[PDB]
Amino acid sequence: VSQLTQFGSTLQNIIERQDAEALNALLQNQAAELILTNLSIQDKTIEEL
Amino acid sequence: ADKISQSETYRRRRQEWEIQRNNAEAELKQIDAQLKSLAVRREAAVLQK
Alpha carbon distance A48, A34 (integer Å): 22
For the beta carbon of residue B44, count every other beta carbon within 10 angstroms: 17
CA distance B6 to A40: 64
Contact B41, A48 (CB under 8 A): yes
Q: How far apart are the first and last CA of chain B?
A: 73
Residue in B with minimal Cα distance to A38:
B48
Helices (H), B1-49: 2-48
Measured distance CA(A20)–CA(A32) in Å, rounded = 19
Q: How large is the C-alpha radius of gyration of chain A?
A: 22
Residues contacting residue A41 through CB under 8 Å, at least 6 positions apart? B44, B47, B48
Way it was determined: cryo-EM
* Chain A residues close to B39, C-beta within 8 Å: none
Q: Do B47 and A44 touch (CB under 8 A)?
A: yes
- Give contacts of A36 with chain B, Cβ < 8 Å: none
Query: Which of B31, B46, B29 lies closest to A44, judged by CA?
Result: B46
DSSP alpha helix (H) spans, A1-49:
2-48
What resolution (Å)? 3.6
Is B43 in the A-facing interface, judged by CB distances under 8 Å? yes
CA distance linking residue B17 with residue B23, whole number of Å: 10
